[model samples]
Target: AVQIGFLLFPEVQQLDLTGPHDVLASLPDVQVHLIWKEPGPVVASSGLVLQATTSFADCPPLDVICIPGGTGVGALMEDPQALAFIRQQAARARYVTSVCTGSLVLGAAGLLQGKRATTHWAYHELLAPLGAIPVHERVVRDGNLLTGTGITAGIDFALTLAAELFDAATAQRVQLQLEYAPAPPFNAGSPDTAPASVVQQARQRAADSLHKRREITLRAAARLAA
Candidate 1:
């Protein structure tokens, strides 16, 4: 049986990790653990607190690792403890994956240098400073690393990852079990195809970031020893 580790940080977007967790957990012979920086209740971006099942200090070695994104990504950039933990533990895992801006943290931890990665669109440009060649694709794979763009894309990421780690038939069976058919009510998925007004609004909304989080991450990344 394969063992999976998911890192849970405070204020993380729930679906970023949960969607993929659900699909992987449904597999016949895999064990999933929700890990946290500490051992206790961790609050989500939506204000939900989930009890962590393991800690960085004691969790068993994992076959796969998943990092979920949220407001936590910004804080984690400055968190030496959290970033270092991922660097050491994830380095040994078979596959290291991220959903949403979790890729930013991977970049910050100096894990994505010279790698092709994708992250939530709003701040994904920061990937450049963190030493990664960021792509606009919804999902990207570079060697052992896998990253996806934005919230709600975790399902597709998981299906893609499953096929890589297991087999096409295994991934297909999981997708079928989840009824993973797509039926969008409208074509607002991306700014390119979205209504002009809607697209502009998204752009405007992103302009109000409280901090230059990317700048901070850039400084932190530059300081890491090669």
Candidate 2:
């Protein structure tokens, strides 16, 4: 079985994990594990409860290890343990990946320096200071490091990974099984597509969290330099 692991933590945006979780789990002969610093349950930003099946110390060698992003990622950026775990796993995994702002965590682990990556659009520019070339696309792959843009893009990220790891046929089968067709009710998914008011509103809503993340990122980047 292909062992795939996802990092779960308090205040994660559940969709960042779940969107790809469902698709990846559907792959034949694949085993998915939720992992954390400690085994137990973690609460998501949307008040969803998710269980972690293993601790980092107990995790098996994984074919893929992914981190999902949200408000919680802010803390992990400065967390030595979390960064260490990511670095350790990434060293051995076939592919190192992340969803949403989770790319920021990879950056903190010093994995993204000089890599082409992407994160939440709100933090796209922030990747540069971490030594990353941030693309605005939904999914980016530079070498074995794959990164997804914000939230719902996790599905796209997973499917893309599936195609790379398995085959186009396998990815297509999984996508069809999930009826992965998307028809968003609005065109507000990106600042360029969304009305100016909607873009401003989103910027306002994310301002505080982004501020905190920026501060943490600066410190993490400094540590990487040192």
Candidate 3:
């Protein structure tokens, strides 16, 4: 059986975790684990509460290690215990993966030096400070390191990993079973496709969080450099 573990933290974007979980859980012979410092209820950024199934101390060695992102990522980057846990697990995991700003967490763990990765468009510049070459894509793969951009991209990230872990056919089957055809009514998913006004509005909405993330990212980068 393949063991897949997701790091569960306060204020994590629920979609970033749940989207991937829903897709990955569809695969056969896979055990999904929601791991945190302690197994308990963790509230997400959107006020959704999720139960962590395992504690860091009790987590088994996993085939896949994934981190999902949100506003809490800034604090997580500075979390030594959490960073150490990732470093330890990533040392032996077959695949190291992340979604959105979770890539920043992996980088904080010193896992993304000189690696090609991606994150939310608003935080793309943060990746460079973390020693990652940021690519503006839904999903990117550099060997065993896989990263997805933004919250919704987590589903795509999981399907990509699913294809790698099993086969394209298996991934396709899972996708079909999940009815994963996306039909977004608006064409505002990316900055490139969205109107200038819409992009500006989005930037305004996340201005404060982005500012905090920038500060934390710089500090984390300095720590990593040291």
Best by lDDT: 3
Pairs with steric clashes in candidate 1: none
TM per prediction: 0.93, 0.96, 0.96
lDDT of 3 by residue, 157-220 (tens): 7887888889999999998888889888988889999999999999999899888888888898
**Cα lDDT of model 1 by residue, 23-104, tens digit:** 9898777898999867789999899878789888888888888889987778888888888888987879999989888888
Residue-by-residue lDDT tens digits, candidate 2, 1-226:
8899999999999988988898888888899999998889899998999999999899999989989998898888988988898898899898998988899899999999999999888888779989998787777888888887767777887888799878999999988888889888988888889999888998999898788877888998899999
Reference-based TM-score, model 3: 0.96
lDDT of each: 0.83, 0.88, 0.90
State the TM-score for model 1.
Answer: 0.93
The full ranking of all candidates by TM-score, starting with the best, is 3, 2, 1
